[PDB]
Symmetry: C3
Subunit: 130 residues, 3 copies
């Protein structure tokens, strides 16, 4: 039984791994909020999805990419006019081998997160085990 769901707590900005520190669900404890990464324990097929809230008045361009280790497997850009919020979101279905790390990276832009209201999220679960 492998499944997790976490949210973002503070304001996030610049190139970095988005660490979702508000962990709601984490069967098997495979998501590490100190790294922001999901580690594959069982070879198989996995679904992942993320929703990242962006602040307006921020230059204006926020990138949030789902990575499998060092490879971009999904991308999203958020960007809005006068003073406004928007979402950079995407979903994947990937095959993973034990040790593979899955996580969201922030490239530039202002990402909003709340103490415990989960406007920005990261979740996933295994669909098939090999």
């Amino acid at each position: 039984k492998i499944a997790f769901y976490a949210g973002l707590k503070r304001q996030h900005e610049g190139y970095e791994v988005l660490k979702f520190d508000d962990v709601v669900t984490n069967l098997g404890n495979h998501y590490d909020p100190t790294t922001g990464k999901f580690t594959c324990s069982i070879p198989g097929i996995y679904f992942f999805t993320y929703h990242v809230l962006m602040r307006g008045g921020d230059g204006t361009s926020m990138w949030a990419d789902l990575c499998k280790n060092n490879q971009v497997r999904a991308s999203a850009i958020a960007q809005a006019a006068d003073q406004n919020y928007d979402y950079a979101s995407n979903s994947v279905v990937l095959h993973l081998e034990p040790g593979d790390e899955v996580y969201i990276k922030l490239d530039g832009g202002k990402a909003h997160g709340g103490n415990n209201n989960k406007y920005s999220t990261f979740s996933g679960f295994i669909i098939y085990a090999d």
Copy 2:
């Protein structure tokens, strides 16, 4: 076999439970469009997701939160400039006990729904049964 998928039909606005009355899928009949709520029958792990379309020229701020009973478990805000649409969307993975209610609440803002075209949606399914 627990899974549902419903859409929104009319214009929705103000604080209220978003009742998705255009039900496409509803295995086990656990989603009630007269309440807009999904009721857990089987203890286990559940995935939920929602996409809510917002109208522009509307003041401009629409909140749509997924709730498990009286608790906010996911949030989204939509908001756009001159005359424009956008989405408040999010996804969760939650553990539920029999009786738990899962649903979307609208906080302020103009939510669009169509008679039978499903621009605004609510869906979910059980991943693991305890």
Copy 3:
């Protein structure tokens, strides 16, 4: 084991089937990038989701609808002000019979896709087999 995940490569615009030609995952080879369609082989319950990136400065209105054969089962509209990107996204849970085709159609608007960076995506998997 039925699951797929594909992205969009070039710029897409006008009424047409969105062919996601950057296929990452495709168990059972049921997604055809030459048609852009997923063909049901096994009667059962299926989850689908799509994220379509739209360019700003484009008139400004992009529609992307998930279709089951010739029927609209989900809709999304993207639309943004000065020079800006946004997403038309939605998710479904549907019952399918062998032969049913599931795919995204583009109605008007500028859809962005990248050679191999997957800003615009299409994915899905079977939840229950009948």
